[PDB]
Subunit: 431 residues, 4 copies
């Protein structure tokens, strides 16, 4: 009863009328969880407890701290992550995100609708960005991105050694919102950094820009993060306010791909509980999603394509709703084939099984993608290697309770090795 | 343009206003064409031109003719069909359909016509050997007294003459002529409302169906079905020798309309037989029954046939009326899988012009179909399947619109996998490749399915064998102009030979 | 049950032939008056059966002949003027001949249908020496400039598109028959695709329009409108004495369809003249043109008529065909304001039967209309307005759906207040009370409007005069069965006497 | 947000949300404010009326009858301070929040301010013997629920101090409980206790509530916020206690437990309104499910046309800070986008340091969220789900709303005596404000519970001719509308009247230009 009665309502109002607090959700949680790591959670042993509580991405705020400090944070993060590698099935990749300092003023001061002469990427940012490339980070949260000319300046700094590092522009000013479209078309994703946004724009208007930015990225198929202050009271209290709970649930209902925690995990006194709460609420909001309107409106807004993979993805999502599938298993190398299934927001989890660890780590940016890293070696026959990576996803889904033997799942593959060829959709029962 | 400008509309109204007569239909014709064969089309030379003009199913009306007669009809249809079998790429399968006689009621030989004045008195007698003047007519039993009663009305000769039982009668019946006119010999009489005690499959029908199974018919049009047991009574007579023969129940009276749901469940398809239905139920209500039965079969994924008087005036004139051109087009927009011609091709003076006209109207109407709404509502009114073939067909048709593919190539042994794709009505044509000739001939009942018979022998490697059939569809799709090399098509496959395993869908480039 | 459906597909499945329609037929019925219906006795029964608008076809007959018909129509109309509660306004429509191309007399004989051999040569000469000397080898047409419009082996259609030819000559033509037939004296010629340069309003149309103003006709059916300038030429010809006469532009050729927007913009309404349209454009595309023009006029709130050959077989048979039964219903479902009858009531054998059938089918079709989508779509596509009348109209239509009212009573001098209500297509009838006789007759053009002519004198207290006409509508609604006492109706009045000023909507109980 | 409201889809409507599209002047969402020490001065209460307060709430969980009678007198004096100008006077209703079945602890170490430090994993005994009643410490805790043993089994969870402290039982002794602390902290005196998933056999209407309700009827309040209604019979007990003298006062059921939501439909049919009461609800049910219950309740009362309020912790951070939380900003807006009739403030106005900024912030966010409402979808779904009524006013109301959208009416002027006609118009959520004209002060105050109804109380005397009395008020509404900036001269307004004096006869809709 994953709010399936509400998902069959002919109207959006009756769908709300049918929401049932006694109807439990599916064990799979589709929204990524980004926890800012700091003094309260840098310990290697407590980082393990945060992975178990559902952390997907470890955020590193570079507004303070030295490279020697952040390298120890990354060292322990990876130590906690690989502590579960003694198990390929239940292992879970954890990403490393670099939030740059950006154009600041420092105690930090703020100035609304003004010019901000500071450059997009100063030498402090360049030395921090090149540090991330050396540390093998998975993504960059570029702060105070005001125009498209800033993302290109950041992309050039990362260079070709980190060409595959995904850039997440942080909308933090009024100019960034006013010029959001050229920023989104230039970025790998967007973060709605409500923290600094609520000071530059009127606080009563932050919800307008958040829902606008999430929708526009939702139609564009790009990840969007809701950031800062979702459970701020949890910094000193073990339970969030009613407003904070509904904020996390509404961000997931708005369509945000990941939800973020900053002070709640960096310096607060209840970092484990804040991660556990965000996991619980996001899973509940995923059940309350009105997929009947979401899947239709996303398809109607999406254009016709000559791309075989895009056509397979829509058909795969349409097939999953038809048979209430346990998961969408997608063989992917660069994550792209999994990203194209995610943009149509299926209900079932997207078990994106891959061999590239960086794509498994970057998979958390997208809603509903559950990456699994296959350490098995390539078989001589390609057919055997494809079905091996699919059976690897079957064993994972059974262990993580995503589905059981006899259930129906959709498997996405392609006709030849290499990337951009995902074009084969199969409806197979779980062995 | 294929009326794609009107397809990208939000409202049905704006979609109606965007309809363009200068928007040429690029797609093939998706609606099946059925044509009754008669003295105007029995010849081989005529039948080949009917195939060229678009005939997908040959209907044989067994209320007239003899087994010897119909046997030569079938022989000529099969001769005309296989005359195009030289090239298997362009070959078109043509099915043969037996239209059961059913529980009809005719009159006696007059004294060739006569005249019954309006308001006069006619004593319908059930006497012995009077099998007829302007006062005393004889029926084929019907047991009219046991089913007739008060001021009941009898309709002689296709409802053109209206009677009115104005008495009771021991073995006769005194009636007043509610609507006059002439009267030929042995004309059919309909008794609306009443429950004709005649059986489901009469002794004549048994010999007909047993003859049809002995002649390898592809489907039967069961006349005057009223209850679900009638379809079972017909399927029993077909037995195990003809268990693969589709049963299309003809809905023709108030009972068959009321009991429609159980009839649809027991039958393989429905024919909206508007001819007799227009006599048994008020003629102004037929469009309601027609739209009701088409939508319900569309909901149930069963074929539905719109039949009779679609191009009636084309029996004597070379062009249809404006009402007839719009009736065919609206039957397509209603959702009819097939359309039918009766006297237009059986005994008319322009049978070819009729088939060509139905092919032309249907192709334009398929462009005017509001696919944006039809597809969403068809999926909404369909339940969660747990069947891999059903889910595969939904994604295939979803990928059909997304990539705007030129065709849906489906490998099918019994047609079922193709029927499940056509259920969701893709704009793109369904190229169903089969090695089973009967499955190719029966695929015509389904809208949008272009069956193609692959006569190539089965290959040893199963991967290479289904590849050979996928290419076979690629060649017939490029030969008939459905798509060119480099286009995107949807190819439906399964994971092992035999039927029931269609589970693979691919978007592959046309070679 | 059908109106309460979340999907259009389920709306079709819930279409019940056992749900009796409401008492109110909303689609106007336009009957062409001819030799079979000119008698006052027959025109009386035509009004009783449901004729709202009498149409005179000025393609034939003389002014003396039509003036007698108009006299007979008004005699049969005022035959019921004694009780103004049951009296039905019946408008008179003038159908212009327009730029018609006709042939001569065959062998100088007005009723000598000659012959034509499929493929035989036929001379198309302009030499007036063959005017009353047409033979099976030489045919004369009255369009002297045909050779400057028709050239590359083009197609020429004679006798309602039945006979088609292919010219093979030049200079003031050798026709090669492409479809044989039987010619006749003074039959119509169509030149599809070619640009006929004939004047919009010929010297003959001037005399008919002058006659029409003198005869106090309510609307003109301007045949063969090619552009908006033609509509303006008709409007100027009518002048001051001819204003208030509604101009219905007949769309009959490719040019009128291509320029439909400018033509509609300058017209009072549109008539889908499928007869000629089916010859000028391919007959398969006519339904696209009809549905396009019906949708576009619905969006604009202007009347649209679907015409010619709706019940064509009823010229000779008392019962229509199934194609004809569905064409009338689909016209109403398309959203046609009026359906028309031409030869069926002018020269046919069953004029009354044809009017009753159109009434029956239209009333059944009005019930089956999916109002949930139509009222929503017609509202979405309609823009916002500062006009209080427009705001009061939508509010009144939404109110009538909410309380399921029996009627929507509107007082109007011009008719406009009633027209703005009918644009949003309520289910309940619109009883437009007026003291203006022409406004009552012209109201027949709009769907759902049931005009009543109040003849009681105007009271001194305007409020009492307003309340008087409201009670008059209550009386006719009670008398005609639209609603009973205790039911709820919507009443629309204004805040001051005079036209416009309609801003009051009151939900009142029927006394 | 006229561009977002024209989108054919919800997604595009969200993408079209312009942060630079200024809202309308009218704020359609009622603002309820709990009155307390930081809000009781009539100098302050005047400032809250001017900052947007429409309903003043009295939490009868604490305080005595003489204390609350002072607040009411202080509230009423603040409102009548504006009655000098009838064209701008804003009615302010007062509301009585009952205590309900409440479980409070005892005094710690004989003080009211003393606090002990509890530690997770430590032990704490819960006894019902009235001896330790004012001798609580980290070892013995007393609570005033006598039968707190015939409900709590072994291993259950008892929550103390607004759910901040968690206990885990381990032993039951009829009179004692040897629990264990799961989450510790400073334990105070007389803190609230929450027992989730237990048949609290305490009555919904206590003897203290029966006296507080009779005090409410005597004090001429406008509505009753009853607490912890588990069944409709509880609403009937409140209804009977109010009797005939209090027959007009609205009963607003606060759902605060698992039984309330499970029987919400039966409760909503028995009440005149609903309060979500998220505070107690987030403790009795998992906090991650509160948004589900809130959305379900707001939707079901929208489908029914009854008022629903979102309460507790909407701007909680503003108790100590002058600027709210983005989550709190997102929460007020999303409550307005959910369709909540009114939004409430509890600690932010009762004891907070910035009560005025919270009222202003709520009025700001609600004005913005009202513009972002997808009126195209809402008005269609409300009509498709509302029945075909035989009432002439329901048809007039939905007909005026459809006409309001058609001409973009500046407002919908409604003449109402019992407010029922303004309620019927509000049920369909027009964008334009509902200027409701009444001579009934009880009506002009109770109209704040419904969204979009801007109540105006006409103090002019009844003219001799009834048709002249209607035009006098219909002209008063445009005076209020022209002044408060809802429209100007020439704009088109919808006016709803009746054919006869007396309630229940409004059936006339008029599209008129403002003079
Ligand atoms: O998701 P991506 O990066 O576009 O690649 C998906 C690819 O994975 C495959 O399943 C197998 O690729 P590999 O040979 O790299 O394992 C292909 O069929 C498909 O093209
Ligand atoms: O349409 P049907 O009756 O399910 O048949 C489809 C079958 O055809 C196949 O494509 C292959 O069948 P064959 O090898 O017998 O030709 C299977 O994948 C599938 O089960
Ligand atoms: O359709 P029209 O021309 O606007 O007629 C509506 C008019 O009729 C009335 O209801 C009454 O008009 P009269 O009584 O003067 O004939 C006016 O209030 C209104 O302006
Ligand atoms: O109290 P309700 O039900 O809202 O009704 C409002 C009433 O106010 C009126 O407009 C005028 O009544 P009053 O004489 O009390 O002013 C009536 O027409 C209507 O019945």
């Amino acid at each position: 009863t994953q709010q399936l009665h509400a998902a069959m309502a002919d109207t959006f109002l009756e769908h709300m009328c049918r929401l049932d607090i006694d109807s439990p959700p599916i064990t799979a949680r589709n929204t990524g969880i980004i926890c800012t790591i700091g003094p309260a959670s840098r310990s290697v042993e407590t980082l393990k407890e945060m992975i178990k509580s559902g952390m997907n991405v470890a955020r590193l705020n570079f507004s303070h701290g030295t490279h020697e400090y952040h390298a120890e944070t990354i060292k322990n993060v990876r130590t906690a992550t690989e502590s579960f590698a003694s198990d390929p099935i239940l292992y879970r990749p954890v990403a490393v995100a670099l939030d740059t300092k950006g154009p600041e003023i420092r105690k930090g001061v703020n100035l609304p609708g003004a010019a901000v002469d500071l450059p997009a990427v100063s030498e402090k940012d360049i030395q921090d960005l090149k540090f991330g490339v050396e540390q093998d980070v998975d993504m960059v949260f570029a702060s105070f991105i005001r125009k498209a000319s800033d993302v290109h300046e950041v992309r050039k700094v990362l260079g070709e050694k980190g060409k595959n590092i995904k850039i997440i522009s942080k909308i933090e000013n009024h100019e960034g919102v006013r010029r959001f479209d050229e920023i989104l078309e230039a970025s790998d994703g967007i973060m709605v950094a409500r923290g600094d946004l609520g000071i530059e724009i009127p606080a009563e208007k932050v919800f307008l820009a958040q829902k606008m930015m999430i929708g526009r990225c939702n139609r564009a198929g790009k990840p969007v993060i809701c950031a800062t202050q979702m459970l701020e009271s949890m910094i000193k209290k073990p339970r969030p306010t009613r407003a904070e709970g509904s904020d996390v649930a509404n961000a997931v209902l708005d369509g945000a791909d990941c939800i973020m925690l900053s002070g709640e995990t960096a310096k607060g006194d209840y970092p484990l509980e804040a991660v556990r709460m965000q996991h619980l609420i996001a899973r509940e909001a995923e059940a309350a999603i009105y997929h009947l309107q979401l899947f239709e409106e996303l398809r109607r807004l999406a254009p016709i394509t000559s791309d075989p993979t895009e056509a397979t993805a829509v058909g795969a999502v349409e097939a999953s709703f038809k048979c209430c599938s346990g998961a969408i298993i997608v063989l992917t190398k660069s994550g792209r084939s999994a990203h194209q299934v995610a943009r149509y927001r299926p209900r079932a989890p997207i078990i994106a099984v891959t061999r590239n660890p960086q794509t498994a780590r970057q998979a958390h940016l997208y809603r509903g993608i559950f990456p699994v890293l296959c350490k098995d070696p390539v078989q001589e026959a390609w057919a055997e290697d494809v079905d091996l990576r699919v059976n690897f996803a079957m064993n994972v889904g059974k262990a993580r309770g995503f589905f059981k033997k006899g259930d129906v799942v959709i498997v996405l593959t392609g006709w030849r090795p290499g990337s951009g060829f995902t074009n084969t959709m199969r409806v197979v029962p779980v062995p």
